[PDB]
Amino acid sequence: GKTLPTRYQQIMKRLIKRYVLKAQVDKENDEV
Amino acid sequence: TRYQQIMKRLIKRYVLKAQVDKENDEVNEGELKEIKQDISSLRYELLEDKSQATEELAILIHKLSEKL
Amino acid sequence: NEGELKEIKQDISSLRYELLEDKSQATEELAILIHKLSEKL
Amino acid sequence: FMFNDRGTSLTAEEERFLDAAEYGNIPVVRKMLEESKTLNVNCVDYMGQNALQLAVGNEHLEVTELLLKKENLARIGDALLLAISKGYVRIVEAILNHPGFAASKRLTDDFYAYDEDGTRFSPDITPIILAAHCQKYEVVHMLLMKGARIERPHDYFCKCGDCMEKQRHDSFSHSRSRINAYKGLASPAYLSLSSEDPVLTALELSNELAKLANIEKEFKNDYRKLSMQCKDFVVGVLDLCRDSEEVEAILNGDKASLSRVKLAIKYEVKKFVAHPNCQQQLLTIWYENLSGLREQTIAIKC
Amino acid sequence: EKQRHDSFSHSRSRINAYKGLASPAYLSLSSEDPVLTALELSNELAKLANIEKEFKNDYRKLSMQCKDFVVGVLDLCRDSEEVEAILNGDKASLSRVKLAIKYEVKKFVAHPNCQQQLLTIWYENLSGLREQTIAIKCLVVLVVALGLPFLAIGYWIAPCSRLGKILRSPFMKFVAHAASFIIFLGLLVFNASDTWTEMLIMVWVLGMMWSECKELWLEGPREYILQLWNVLDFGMLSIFIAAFTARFLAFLQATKAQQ
């Protein structure tokens, strides 16, 4: 103050799954 | 009226143009994976066809050998 | 051009249908021959 | 600490079943559909897609059709969304003829929920939204042929009951669902297949998206991108014409009452007015009465 | 033992192990949480890029790739709970953003989701001005915040009131420090053109120096000299001190004389 002069593991599992699916899908968009 | 006909014509032209232009773009690996998968599907299906044909021919041959 | 991949896919499916029809006609001929052989006995 | 899906890989029989259903080994799955112990959910894979899910993943129409005749499958809505995403019209149409989908399950929670929680693709999104995102035209025609109009997103400053309830305790997802609805409404497909005329709706939508980009400071790049895409749709549709009558009905609508160009410059659609066809019509009206000087040699005679 | 008789292959195997540990795949499948491991690994790879001069491009590339993994994983979320568990971890105890800016992950903090959370906490108490029309109303609000006596009286006499809760919001502290700086400049300019003003300026610069004292006391001297603007601020306040002490010495001497 300057006036004057558990849930964690489940969230992480969900995000990691999302990231893996996203990367696997994006690898298909690249060139041949 | 004329308005609806003109709009129908232009919309049809635009849809055909977009569908044709989507083919000019670069290739997606999903298409090669899909072609590969359909090739393997065809392989399995033709193997099953050859197997059923061999079974039918064997049944006919067993019948012909038992008739004699 | 994607048209070339679509065209290759279409020809693959054409080949699939044609070979299925060939297997069907072959099975019909074999069944006719088997019916003849079973009726001869 | 490697995360997993099941406790342990239980069955080798059904593992082989799943791995043959992956590569489309239709004699194996057909022989095994009727004689096996159980066609369970077989998500032993690291990510956990059901045999139906996996089969739809790789465009196996025979496998999908043989599985839809089992009446004991889950993840159906999820497989439909996935197939819309890829863009395989055969599989989507085959899934739409499955029982239970006769209750108008589109825009009329327990469904789509794969992995017993956390369904992919933005839990506020219905099939038609994904279909408009993925530019699939036949899919849009299929869905709209069964109804399910997209929903209009509410006003930003509006303090209605539902908007207020979803503002408190639901913040940062209200803005996200709003930007999602605006992303779906602004696709070329939906704009070309929904309304009577796309031109007027597109222009006014572009202006509304620009105003909302100015109001809401965050995500400014996204609203800018959407409205630019809509400008480009308008310019393309205008360019695709080939007759005088067409360019007249586009530029004016139902040269007295030259309105749509006026609204275009009022909404600031740069590339619309600068098109060679628009420019041609403007230089035909600009030298209206005297033509002997329109074809003049140089500016010295002028 | 692997340094002697085995040189140039020890550094190569080291860079190989660091290239493998920094892949998106291994980082996403090995550890319990990838975010913290990735950030700390990025900082370690940057430090080793600075230490070992050769192959600097390679370590730079690896640590940039790790920054990009972190930013992507953060971007892929869709709920309030997820962005909160990512930005903070197990809005009290806002730590992972602090470590992110300490390790200098540029694109991490500049993401629209992080920015959204920061602008929700930034206008914490007063929302009626977060949705304000233009910056002209904000300028009007600062001009009306130029009324310091009301604020000081209400703060030290009876806190926890409506105005006591308003002052406990970050935008207020910011605009109040800006107003103090502005009125200091104003007093300077007023004193410029044609005794009380002199002492007021002296008290203001003494307050600035006490603020800087409380500032550099919090951390070690190295953290104090770390920034560059603090050096200029310190030099400026000390110059004011020296000038006013010279004026005071001259005043005392002339007073004794003409006395």
Helix axes D220-239, D276-286, angle to 10 degrees: 60
Q: Write out D133-202 in H/E/C secondary structure.
A: HCCCHHHHHHHHHCCCCCCCCCCCCCCCHHHHHCCCCCCCCHHHHHHHHHHHHCCHHHHHHCCCCHHHHH
**Residue B15: closest CA among D252, E123, D233:** D233
Other C-beta atoms lying within 10 Å of the C-beta of residue B21: 10
Q: Please provide the distance, in angstroms rounded to a whole number, between the alpha carbons at the two ends of chain E.
A: 84
Interface of D with A (CB under 8 A): 3, 47, 115, 117-118, 120
Cα–Cα dist D94/D152, whole Å: 30
Experimental method: cryo-EM
Q: Do chains E and B touch (3 or more CB pairs under 8 A)?
A: no
Cα–Cα dist B14/B21, whole Å: 10
DSSP string, E188-201: HHHHH---HHHHHH
Pick the residue from chain B with its C-alpha nearest to A24.
Answer: B30
Q: In Å, what is the CA distance from E122 to each residue of E87, E91, E116, E173?
A: 15, 11, 10, 11
Is some CB atom of chain E closer than 8 A to the CB atom of A1? yes
Other C-beta atoms lying within 10 Å of the C-beta of residue A15: 23
Q: In Å, what is the CA distance from D105 to each residue of D110, D271, E60?
A: 12, 41, 51
- Residue B42 CB contacts under 8 Å (≥ 6 apart), including other chains: C12, C15, C16, C19
Q: In Å, what is the CA distance from D138 to each residue of C7, D62, D145, D186, E147?
A: 19, 21, 10, 17, 65
Buried b (16+ CB within 10 A) or exposed e, D29-60: beebeeeeeebebbbbbeebbbbbbbbbbbbb
Query: CB of E125 within 8 A of CB of E166?
Result: yes
Tokens of E120: 């929700």
Cα–Cα dist B2/A17, whole Å: 54
Is some CB atom of chain B closer than 8 A to the CB atom of D151? no
Classify residue D198 as exposed, middle or buried by CB count within 10 Å of its CB (0-12, 13-18, 19+): buried
- Residue D281 CB contacts under 8 Å (≥ 6 apart), including other chains: D247, D248, D251, D255
Q: Which residues of A touch E210 (CB under 8 A)?
A: 5
CA dihedral D78, D82, D85, D90 (to 10 degrees): -110
Look up tokens 């077989």; give the residue: D42
Is some CB atom of chain E closer than 8 A to the CB atom of D169? no
Query: CB of D135 within 8 A of CB of D188?
Result: yes
Q: Coil, strand, or helix at residue E169?
A: coil
Cα–Cα dist D107/D181, whole Å: 14
Q: Coil, strand, or helix at residue D282?
A: helix
Breaks, C-N > 2.5 A, in chain D lie after 108, 254
Q: Coil, strand, or helix at residue D58?
A: coil
Tokens of E101: 């800016």
Classify D253 in phi/psi space as left (phi over 0), alpha (psi -120 to 50) or beta.
Answer: left
Q: Which chains touch B (3 or more CB pairs under 8 A)?
A: A, C, D
Query: CB of E35 within 8 A of CB of E86?
Result: yes
Share of chain A residues as helix, strand and coil, in percent rounded to the nearest 5? 60, 0, 40
Tokens of D35: 């004689």
Q: Please provide the distance, in angstroms rounded to a whole number, between the alpha carbons at the two ends of chain A.
A: 58
Q: In Å, what is the CA distance from E220 to each residue of A2, C41, E104, E191?
A: 21, 108, 20, 38
- Residue D151 CB contacts under 8 Å (≥ 6 apart), including other chains: D107, D181
Per DSSP, D47 falls in state S
Query: CB of D81 within 8 A of CB of D111?
Result: no
Q: Coil, strand, or helix at residue D80?
A: helix
What is the widest separation between alpha-carbon atoms in chain B? 83
Query: CB of C12 within 8 A of CB of B38?
Result: yes
Show the CA angle centred on residue D187, arms to residues B2 and D126, nearest 5°.
Answer: 115
Report phi then psi at E132, rounded to 5.
-70, 160
- Residue D218 CB contacts under 8 Å (≥ 6 apart), including other chains: D175, E112, E115, E116, E119
Cα–Cα dist E62/D77, whole Å: 40
Is some CB atom of chain A closer than 8 A to the CB atom of E82? yes
What is the widest separation between alpha-carbon atoms in chain C? 61
Q: Which of C1, C8, C27 sits opposite B35 (nearest CB)?
A: C8
Tokens of E121: 């906490």
- Residue E212 CB contacts under 8 Å (≥ 6 apart), including other chains: E230, E233, E234, E237
Is some CB atom of chain E closer than 8 A to the CB atom of A22? yes
- Residue E121 CB contacts under 8 Å (≥ 6 apart), including other chains: E91, E94, E170
Cα–Cα dist E21/E10, whole Å: 17
- Residue D148 CB contacts under 8 Å (≥ 6 apart), including other chains: D106, D107, D108, D126, D127, D128
In angstroms, the separation between the Cα of residue D248 and the nearest Cα of chain B is 10
Cα–Cα dist C30/B56, whole Å: 8
Q: Which residues of D touch E32 (CB under 8 A)?
A: 1
Cα–Cα dist C13/C9, whole Å: 6
Tokens of D192: 């070309």
DSSP string, E181-230: HHHHHHHHHHHH---HHHHHHHHHHHHHHHHHHHHHHHS-HHHHHHSSHH
Q: Which residues of D touch A19 (CB under 8 A)?
A: none
Tokens of D85: 């995403």
Is some CB atom of chain B closer than 8 A to the CB atom of D138? no
Q: Do chains A and D touch (3 or more CB pairs under 8 A)?
A: yes
Pick the residue from chain E with its C-alpha nearest to D156.
Answer: E131
Cα–Cα dist D250/B11, whole Å: 12
Per DSSP, D116 falls in state G
Tokens of D231: 């400008």
- Residue D273 CB contacts under 8 Å (≥ 6 apart), including other chains: D261, D264, D265, D279
Look up tokens 């001297």; give the residue: E221
- Where is the binding site, in residues of D? 59
Look up tokens 């010295």; give the residue: D300
Tokens of D284: 């035909």
- Residue D146 CB contacts under 8 Å (≥ 6 apart), including other chains: D104, D106
- Residue D236 CB contacts under 8 Å (≥ 6 apart), including other chains: B14, B17
Residue D9's Cβ-side half-sphere holds a number of Cα atoms within 13 Å equal to 10
Separation of CA E48 from chain center: 26
Q: Tell me whether residue B56 is annotated as binding.
A: no
Is some CB atom of chain E closer than 8 A to the CB atom of A21? no
Cα–Cα dist E114/E108, whole Å: 8
Classify residue D199 as exposed, middle or buried by CB count within 10 Å of its CB (0-12, 13-18, 19+): buried
Q: Which of E32, E78, E112 sits opposite D1 (nearest CB)?
A: E32
Tokens of D232: 């480009």
Cα–Cα dist D152/D181, whole Å: 8
Å resolution of this model? 4.4
Q: Which chains touch D (3 or more CB pairs under 8 A)?
A: A, B, E
- Helical H runs in A1-32? 7-26
Q: Coil, strand, or helix at residue E28?
A: helix
Separation of CA D103 from chain center: 23
Is some CB atom of chain E closer than 8 A to the CB atom of D101? no
Residue type, D237: V
Look up tokens 């949705």; give the residue: E131
Is some CB atom of chain C closer than 8 A to the CB atom of B46? yes
CB pairs under 8 A between A and E: 52
Cα–Cα dist D195/D191, whole Å: 7
Cα–Cα dist D86/D154, whole Å: 30
State whether E173 and A11 contact (CB < 8 Å).
no
Residue type, D5: D
Query: CB of D260 within 8 A of CB of D251?
Result: yes
Query: CB of C34 within 8 A of CB of B63?
Result: yes
